[PDB]
């Protein structure tokens, strides 16, 4: 069915990670890479990366250091139309990192500069 987002209906916890990002106008040059750096996803115990590939926007979420996930995690992206301060936003894509998986959990979409994107990662 349509993507279902539990956040922001529910509140996030101390080990959740949230961030937002913009996509640049597609006429602005990027230097693309087959394997861009992972960064720690705040206090979640996971790593993440947000990048583009030939354009597609991609989010990967994985345990550190070749480990398996020790729990189940919900990964959600909402998109909010730009220049619309009263916009409600849409639940856009979701993914799961399941207990025992190695990852990454991945989400991708056709790159679009007309929305701001909001990522949440949380343990179930």
Numbering used by the authors: 36 to 89, 94 to 163
Which sentences did the original study use to describe this structure?
In an attempt to resolve the structural requirements underlying I‐2‐mediated recognition of Avr2, and its relationship to virulence, we determined the crystal structure of this effector. Structural homology searches revealed that Avr2 shares an overall β‐sandwich fold with the Pyrenophora tritici‐repentis effector ToxA and TRAF‐domain containing proteins, despite sharing no identifiable sequence similarity (no difference from chance). Given the lack of sequence identity, concluding that Avr2 shares a specific function with Tumor necrosis factor Receptor Associated Factor (TRAF)‐domain containing proteins (such as interfering with host ubiquitin ligase activity) is not possible. However, it is tempting to speculate that Avr2, in having this protein fold, may function (like other TRAFs) as an adapter unit, competing with host factors for target binding or binding to a host target and modulating its function. The crystal structure of Avr2 has revealed that Fol race 3 variants Avr2V41M, Avr2R45H, Avr2R46P and Avr2T50− are all within surface‐exposed residues that cluster on a loop, forming a distinct epitope. Notably, the residues that form this epitope are anchored in position by Cys40 forming a disulphide bound at one end (the far N‐terminus), and at the start of β1 (residue Ser51). Such an anchored extension is not observed in ToxA or other TRAF‐like proteins. We predict that molecular interactions involving this region are critical for I‐2‐mediated recognition and underlie the ability of the Fol race 3 variants to evade this. Our screen identified two threonine residues in Avr2 (Avr2T53 and Avr2T145) that are required for virulence (suppression of PTI), but not for I‐2‐mediated recognition. Avr2T145 is positioned within a putative functional site identified from comparison with the ligand‐bound structures of Speckle‐type POZ (SPOP) protein and TRAF6, and Avr2T53 is positioned within a putative functional site identified from comparison with the ligand‐bound structure of SIAH1.
Fusarium oxysporum f. sp. lycopersici (Fol), the causal agent of tomato wilt disease, produces effector protein Avr2. Avr2 is required for Fol virulence in susceptible tomato varieties, but triggers resistance in plants carrying I‐2 (Houterman et al., 2009). The Avr2 protein is recognized by I‐2 inside the plant nucleus (Ma et al., 2013) and exerts its virulence function inside host cells (Di et al., 2016). Consistent with the potential for Avr2 to target a conserved defense mechanism in different hosts, we demonstrate that Avr2 suppresses PRR (FLS2)‐mediated responses, such as growth inhibition, ROS production, MAPK activation and callose deposition following flagellin22 (flg22) treatment.
